[PDB]
């Protein structure tokens, strides 16, 4: 059964079926006799990887010891300390200790039971894997798969790479020269432990590389008696001809994951089958897979073509924009466009990240949709399953997977709510451009660089130029100097019930066609049950939406956390007068008999419930005014088409914290003007002050419930057996804790120094900038969002915008 092609709304291909040359290799062939005492796989190899490399060809090199600068790694260690940093965990030297505290982390939000989760490992850990997700350690000797592939990788010829590197290098299996380059024997193993790996007992000859050019299949046939049993082979393969275009809604194809064996071979697979395990290629599996065929025989019926919604066109302009913007962003002087050209202030480095998504406002087809860091398709088809090369992993869509503060772009959201409440757009204040409440500034982005205000600003002037001031104000119901009601009642709780209206509390409608994490609309009850269940255990503010938490949310920080995919839809009710869409990036199935089906045909389009969808010209009115005079007017005042925009900067206050708070501060010691030696000795002296101290306040706990006459008296016993001993309380041996203690001997040892001074060399959270967008403004097709967090400058979220608005709209 040939794979289903997947093309574009207008037949482009994006994946398709090719023929490959490629080169194989013989495990015994090269090897010839130990008779002639040649062991020449070691000249053949070294000949196969230097030909290659001069011909400029990608080769499969799996060989676990990778030189990363002048060191040797194992790529085992690398996936442990890599995946750990995605799953949120302290990356040090125990399996147990991290599967138990991430378990602990997922069953703090609501994944089952907390009892289920102190529950006998082979019934637990079979469930949270049987849930969906991965087990990617081993249940009975709780250790890494890949701990355990290292243990056996080394037993098949317990500590050091480097080490391994030379002992693995003149071991029975391979024996070099030991006269020869680490740099040309590491090129050799590439070749001989594939051979090793591929089979103790293999099908056939192995293959070294895949794609490859004429001039480097001749320089292998006349070639011929020289690097004995190299082939030339065909085989087929996946193909995706634009390469990383639209790489995280196609995915990819691969070999079945190792856990879902079992499945694959009930739902009718063999291991060897390529499967999608990304995007539409999962997704459409069974569709793309087609039906097999077999005296007599019946030919195999083809996947259906799955044509998506996109066009291959607009997307080649939305993923060249994001790679323009961010390799321009950093030092790169100049974004070259075909509308007008901005010459780009160089102060933005370390932005390494965008997500933009176009999507068709009527009917929420998605048009375009791009992440960066991406990934070429085609590299996991030959065979790969890490690219990699605060890092963004470029497998993650982040505008279906990227929760994000929204910033500017939910002003429109606080607004709708106003007006939804009583507020007459009218309404103007003197904008002073900051709000005091604490010590700590609420200020306008125009105060806070260079102590600016809005002068006279109603509604209109707000959305144009985005005054935190007013969306404060409005969001309250209060102007703030005095905290006096303005005519309307509103709060984050009102705030929070338009985040809900406009589909930011749910999925987009890509979940099932795509990988997505949709956002949550941040839940005032979660707030109040979290604070009163550390109040009961602790009697053994907080509780409601403060003014400042109000504030942060009225202009899209704090708590709001949302896609781009989600943002789109919310923008997209505005644009087509207050309708909720649901994206699709799967349009339509064509049989290998040209019969067609509309798979988006199904597709909600709910009427939102609001008092009055007039309200939503208001936002349009404020939205048109950012275009022509507001923060966009330097991309679209002088642009043809007419468009609705919000545009803004974001600073989010504060410090990264990093993956070991008390390596963190032995780092830094010195700069503390502190002796390490001294920080460590005074840490541990007050844990052990607070051990003792706690020993003896237990003490006096056990003996006042063995006074309790009317007691059970085989608890009595417990109490007895616990305080028999004496009783030595000891501090959990948590990162938290350790660096807690570490901290306060930082500040006695050094009595001047603040916490600020101890945190600088974190990195900050840092600025981010959206753009939102529909066209045209009147009768609008199009909306289009586009992030780019570490984002300095509006600029880097205005040009991609207007490049694909202007693509669309026929310029
Ligand atoms: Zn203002």
Not at 596 to 606: A, F, H, L, P, R
Request: aromatic residues 8%; contains cysteine.
């Amino acid at each position: 059964a040939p794979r289903g092609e997947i093309k574009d709304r207008y037949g482009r291909l994006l994946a398709g079926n090719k023929n490959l040359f490629t080169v194989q290799v013989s495990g015994n062939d090269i090897n010839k006799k130990d008779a002639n005492k040649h062991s020449r796989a070691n000249e053949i190899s070294l000949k196969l990887i230097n030909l290659l490399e001069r011909n400029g060809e990608e080769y499969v090199d799996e060989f676990p010891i990778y030189v990363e600068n002048g060191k040797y790694y194992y790529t085992y260690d690398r996936d442990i300390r890599e995946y750990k940093s995605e799953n949120g965990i302290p990356n040090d030297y125990n399996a147990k200790e991290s599967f138990y505290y991430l378990v602990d982390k997922l069953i703090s939000a609501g994944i089952l039971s907390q009892e289920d989760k102190r529950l006998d490992a082979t019934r637990l850990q079979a469930k949270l894997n049987e849930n969906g997700y991965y087990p990617p350690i081993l249940v009975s000797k709780w250790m890494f798969t890949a701990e355990r592939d290292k243990r056996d990788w080394l037993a098949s010829y317990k500590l050091s790479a480097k080490e391994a590197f030379e002992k693995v290098r003149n071991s029975d299996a391979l024996e070099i020269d030991k006269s020869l380059s680490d740099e040309d024997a590491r090129k050799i193993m590439v070749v001989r432990d594939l051979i090793k790996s591929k089979g103790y007992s293999q099908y056939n000859p192995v293959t070294i590389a895949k794609d490859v050019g004429e001039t480097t299949i001749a320089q292998i046939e006349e070639s011929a008696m020289d690097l004995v049993g190299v082939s030339i082979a065909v085989e087929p393969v996946r193909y995706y001809p634009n390469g990383s275009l639209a790489s995280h809604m196609l995915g990819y194809v691969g070999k079945m994951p190792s856990t879902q064996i079992e499945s694959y071979l009930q739902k009718g697979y063999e291991t060897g089958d390529m499967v999608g395990l990304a995007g539409v290629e999962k997704s459409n599996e069974s569709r793309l897979r087609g039906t097999d065929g077999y005296i007599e025989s019946k030919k195999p019926k083809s996947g259906d073509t799955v044509y998506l919604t996109l066009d291959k066109d607009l997307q080649e302009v939305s993923d060249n924009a994001l790679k323009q913007i961010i390799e321009v962003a950093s030092k790169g002087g100049t974004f070259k466009s075909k509308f007008g050209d901005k010459p780009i202030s160089a102060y933005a480095g370390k932005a390494q990240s965008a997500a933009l998504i176009a999507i068709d406002v009527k009917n929420g087809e998605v048009l375009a949709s791009s992440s960066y860091p991406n990934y070429d398709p085609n590299k996991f088809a030959k065979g790969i399953s890490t690219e990699d090369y605060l890092a963004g992993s470029p497998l993650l869509n982040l505008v279906t997977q990227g929760e994000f503060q929204p910033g500017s772009s939910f002003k429109m959201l606080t607004s709708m709510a106003a007006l939804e409440n009583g507020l007459d757009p009218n309404f103007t204040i003197n904008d002073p451009g900051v709000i005091m409440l604490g010590k700590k500034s609420f200020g306008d982005y125009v105060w806070n660089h260079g102590r600016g205000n809005h002068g006279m600003t109603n509604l209109y002037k707000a959305i144009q130029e985005s005054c935190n001031i007013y969306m404060a104000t409005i969001g309250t119901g209060k102007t703030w100097p005095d905290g006096k009601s303005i005519g309307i009642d509103m709060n984050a709780n009102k705030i929070l019930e338009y985040a809900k209206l406009f589909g930011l509390d749910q999925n987009t409608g890509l979940q099932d066609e795509v990988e997505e994490r949709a956002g949550k609309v941040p839940s005032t009850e979660d707030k109040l049950k979290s604070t009163q269940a550390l109040l009961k255990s602790n009697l053994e503010n907080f509780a409601k939406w403060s003014t400042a938490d109000t504030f942060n949310l009225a202009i899209g920080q704090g708590e709001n956390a949302y896609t781009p995919a989600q943002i789109s839809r919310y923008v997209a009710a505005i644009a087509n007068g207050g309708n909720l869409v649901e994206l699709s990036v799967v349009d339509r199935a064509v049989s290998s008999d040209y019969s067609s089906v509309k798979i988006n045909d199904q597709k909600k389009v709910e009427k939102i419930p609001f008092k009055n969808p007039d309200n939503l010209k208001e936002l349009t009115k404020g939205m048109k005014l950012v275009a022509r005079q507001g923060t966009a007017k330097s991309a679209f005042a002088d642009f043809p088409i007419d468009v609705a925009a919000k545009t803004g900067t974001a600073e989010k206050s504060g410090k990264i914290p990093t993956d070991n708070e008390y390596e963190y501060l032995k780092s830094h010691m010195s700069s503390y003007n502190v002796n390490l030696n001294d920080a460590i000795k005074l840490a541990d002296k007050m844990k052990a002050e607070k051990e003792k101290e706690l020993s003896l306040a237990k003490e006096k706990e056990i003996k006042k419930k063995l006074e309790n006459k009317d007691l059970k008296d085989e608890e009595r016993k417990k109490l007895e057996e616990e305080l028999e001993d004496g009783v030595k309380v000891r501090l959990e041996d948590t990162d938290k804790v350790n660096s807690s203690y570490l901290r306060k001997a930082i500040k006695e040892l050094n009595p001047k120094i603040t916490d600020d001074q101890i945190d600088r060399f974190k990195q900050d959270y840092g600025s981010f900038t959206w753009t939102v967008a529909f066209a045209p403004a009147d009768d609008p097709e199009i909306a289009v969002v586009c992030v780019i967090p570490q984002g300095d400058s509006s600029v880097f979220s205005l040009l991609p915008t207007r490049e694909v608005i202007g693509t669309y709209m026929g310029l």
